[PDB]
């Protein structure tokens, strides 16, 4: 008897982040190549410049099918690895091992929602 | 010695940043056509929350993908779908309920709880 009803799912945003993560772990659907000393990380150009600016500065404006980005060499893969994690799980590990690497790759690609208290 | 953070707001943060991604045709891959009207996406997106899309867009070409919704869908059932896949939410009222809920079964939306549908009648 309701005019008007607003409808919320408390699990809608877990299941996309969940089904893109399968689809990047798969191969599947993905549409841009990242570059990490060398190594081949899979990812859509869309959540990647969801959760960075400097993807997001990169990647607008290539409207092509495939996308190949190498990140530079101040870029490590014990650094970029785990903040790849947290764009597709929400996830970010921590250790005394990667947690310089990890910082500096945080403030090199400008991962937004990362604060620096965790440090 | 390992700090483990899990975050809460960050589904939501991205789904909320490919829902500007998406109402300023940027960074999508997909247009939609419904009564002719475009609606611009990302396949990646519509196939997690639509079998009808999925079985459309899996094994399909890199480049840009067009896919053309019957006559059986409106727009004044589907601009409230593809709000909720973006948002997870959806606004529902006594004038679009019916041919929402029918446009639910046609694409077989995930994660509405078909519970909802009779708050309006």
Request: net charge negative.
């Given at each position: 008897s309701m005019s008007v009803?607003?409808?919320?799912?408390?699990v809608h945003s877990t299941n996309v982040l969940l089904?893109?993560?399968?689809?990047?772990?798969?191969?599947?659907?993905?549409?841009?190549?990242?570059?990490?000393?060398?190594?081949?990380?899979r990812a859509h150009r869309s959540v990647l410049a969801a959760c960075s600016s400097y993807f997001h500065s990169r990647i607008v404006g290539q409207a092509d099918g495939e996308l190949n980005i190498t990140l530079p060499e101040e870029v490590t893969v014990k650094g970029f690895e785990p903040l790849i994690q947290f764009a597709y799980t929400a996830k970010l590990i921590l250790s005394k091992e990667n947690v310089d690497e990890v910082c500096k790759c945080v403030e090199f690609l400008s991962v937004h929602n990362i604060e620096e208290s965790c440090f």
């Open positions: 009803f607003a409808y919320e799912s408390s089904s893109l993560n399968d689809q990047r772990k798969k191969d599947v659907l993905c549409d841009v190549t990242i570059f990490v000393e060398g190594q081949r990380f």
